[model samples]
Target: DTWRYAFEEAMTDVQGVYAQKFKEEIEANSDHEIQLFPYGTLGESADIMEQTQDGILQFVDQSPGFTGSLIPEAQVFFVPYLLPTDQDHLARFFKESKAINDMFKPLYADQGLELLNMFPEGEVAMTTKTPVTTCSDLDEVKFRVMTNPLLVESYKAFGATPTPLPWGEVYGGLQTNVIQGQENPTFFLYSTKIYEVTDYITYAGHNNFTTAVMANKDFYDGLSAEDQQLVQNAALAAYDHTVVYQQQAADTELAKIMEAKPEMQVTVLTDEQRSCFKEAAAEVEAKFIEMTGDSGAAILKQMKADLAAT
Candidate 1:
């Protein structure tokens, strides 16, 4: 049988690489075949997610930013500074965290998705028309964010007027001055040419881009126990491969961006500088509790303990 899978990036980007690795592992070890649909081939992120839910696709990879609407608790990922940006710590957290492995499973299952694996894509950075060293520098900046409300709250707390825009419009929005800035991993900024329209790249050390791979619940449940194990093992192997694959991706992508746009100003915020943004995290965290209530609060508490342990 051929299993269909879809993800939210080109074949060369993080999600695509993960999907490819997963396909290789599954195909190598089993008689079943897997097909990949990357980015626009199947439509946008939400479109692919719906297809997965409907069992039109067996598996899909998507960020919490898009899933937040369907599973409110997933928005917990947007709680600023809640997740460590250090690669080793982040990988370990995802591998062993109860909040991800246990708590998030039911949430996704309720939406007809089987949460297979969640991993960090890379550290998120902001690209803008102007440099930002402090919270005030972001004042009146029309920042672009995902359709997720928590992310809207995040940029607001950082002092920008958050504008929710789909990924397709971001480049044009920046180019046409409809939006002043946007946040994404460095590799994405390079891969999608987001740096060309923005003059500044700021690493605020606030959050890392996180994505989850999942299978349709009906499809997963119907799988034979042995096939289930194969799929699970493939997801784990792909996660590990992607982690190592991204070890130098940010640095490498930034280098490319600089080579292409030598005049782009890049700033890594100092601890003191980041403190101002960290201060807003509390309000966002409070807002998270408000949005998802007890379930979210429990997950956030577990995630904090999980991060602390890591």
Candidate 2:
């Protein structure tokens, strides 16, 4: 996996262009000035979300999957079969759905902060040391994943022992065979080159991760409406740029990943196999709800309705 650039790089390039345009517009209009964080120099993605609440950072991009650690409703995207094959639908849904925006942005407000916009990063794939065309293929494998209870349960439900390894040490663990597999989006996988180290890349895209820009509500709201409008414009610009670049380039990147490492086996699930995994995954989700209660149950219901409508 070496086909896509780091999202941090993408963020820099996109925001750079937006800032240039903004500066030009401001210089042309009057002595107005605008500021932008050129890179994530302020903080990393998830930590930045917390910084936003603390009024230490004005805006931050964070994946809601991690944010779900706090805003539990944000975990709906991780529910199996939710929002399949529609990254555009997701950004659109986030914009239109008060529920989703509320889940992400208003969580900020609850803690004295705000979220500007939602953008889709992507649904990551299951990359394994062995071919995992079905659960049986992965049944005995140990998989390294995030510390999400749902994902840990997912590996357990699939008959794989879920090994919770921090992403930083995953490569070393993979090399040691301490974990046999991991999952990520094509861009993320290809960029990280996990494909080179692993053998299989399958589309077990259970978690649709998204990135959002958030700010301290008091600080952001303290700005003039015109300044607030500028932040909105910047977020919208970044969202549009990211969507077109990510969605259009994803398939091409997938091809490049396979071509870059011909030794790696890429098994797209056959319709029947997909069906089997769907059933298996559904069972996992059902049990997750049983353990977590109506919160998880309600999340699944909302996801089903949203995905169906999309």
Candidate 3:
């Protein structure tokens, strides 16, 4: 059978890059053929996730921001400052972190998904029509977020009116002023042309965008032992390839953005300036525990320890 993989990005973005590498590895090493469905080829993020869960697709790549509803402990990624923005540190954490390899596995298993690997795309930055230096500047700003409750609360605590909008509507929403701003890794902003609609990009150093590669549990489990090992090896090889791909992606993508739109204002907030946004993390962390209860707490604690170890 031809295996199908779908992800929430264009073929040029990070998720697509990882998927392509995995496809190449699989084809080279096994008899199985693979078909890739980039964003909107199948449907939106939620639609493709449903297909994966229902076994219509063999694999899917989605951010925890979208999966938090199904697997609440996964929302730990939303806790501001919980993930370091440094690329090497992040790569090590993803490779060695027990929270990701061990703790998050069962949570995904419970949802009928096999967690293959989770990787960082890039540090997140926000693009807005108006420039912002502090949380006060975001007051009343309608900030678009994924359909995750923790993100909604995080933005709420940051002083914006958080608007949960699907990825499909984000560009038009910004273009028409339906939403004032949205946050994403710089590469995504460049690849998707979000900077065309928004005039300013702010790097608040709050968090890194993370995405998970998952397979349908039934499909993964039913594979022959040899095929299962091949799939796992393919994911590992892809992970290594993507880490190198992203090391320079942020700088390269931002340079392209500047070359295309020379007048776009870019701000890298000082630690003091970012402190205001960091203050909201406490409330968001508390909300996470409340939402997920004890299981979430243990995951959060382990994640912190894991980050410290990294």
Candidate 4:
């Protein structure tokens, strides 16, 4: 009733947008009034997840890398260079794997959450005050990192001790020189005006920014099966919309970074340099395998096997 209405109204604005595309399916099946709370209406990213999981809110547009704390296994996607630059490889892994979703189900369920469709959010790279040409160059720098262990450790392997911080704090942290660097997708970097504080950009194309629209599982389970299907369909549609928009945004926004800050150097790692980063990232995986035990090993193996097969 109340939840359906919230979703319905949310669908109107989210209608055609990527990751928000599933709204039409929602509208078609349910005549119930829906209310919408836009981004930042609720709170910051972490707050929104907390609200959704506790059932105080029905849904949230979230980065899986952030929500993974609720279901640590979801961090599987955060492994640096884990997914290739090819979108197809990432898509195949997400679309075809039940094991992937299953890994997250129990953890999410324990917290009264449900994993919904995933939308691709692009990859992370540098927007820094200093140039990063090689791992050696990152030595002792206080780099900004998100809350993922995979990312924190991955960047650490590059010689930067990445300090995870809230998204809102990043700009001020940069301006004050509290942190020397940060990494994000072009859309996010440009949207956040990260270029305003950082002087260099790198095309490391590290982890794919996979976003998920997760809801409270108890709330989901209460819905009619037909309505449940609508939710699923809408999630997929919204995700598709998000992916398309993200790709275009990634291409166009990076150009703005160059045009606006002509002196802001952009570094594309040499093949040899890439090899070094790749080798170092392997240590990140080894550490993860040891941290999470056999299950992590299974996921890593499954992902590689799937990537190879596809």
- Residue 175's lDDT within candidate 4 is 98
lDDT of 3 by residue, 17-39 (tens): 89999999999997898899998
Off by over 4 Å in 2: 1-46, 287-310
lDDT of each: 0.91, 0.63, 0.91, 0.69
- Model 4, runs deviating above 4 Å: 4-16
Task: List the candidates' TM-scores in order.
Answer: 0.98, 0.80, 0.98, 0.89
With a 3 Å backbone cut-off (N, CA, C), the pairs that clash in candidate 1 are none
Instruction: Write down the TM-score for model 3.
Output: 0.98
lDDT of 4 by residue, 109-176 (tens): 77777778655656677877777888888888898887777768887888887898877788899999
For candidate 2, list the clashing residue pairs, or say none: 1-190, 1-193, 2-190, 113-217, 124-184, 124-185, 125-184
Please list the Cα RMSD from the true structure of every candidate, rounded to 1 decimal place.
1.0, 5.4, 0.9, 3.3
Candidate 2: lDDT over CA atoms? 0.63
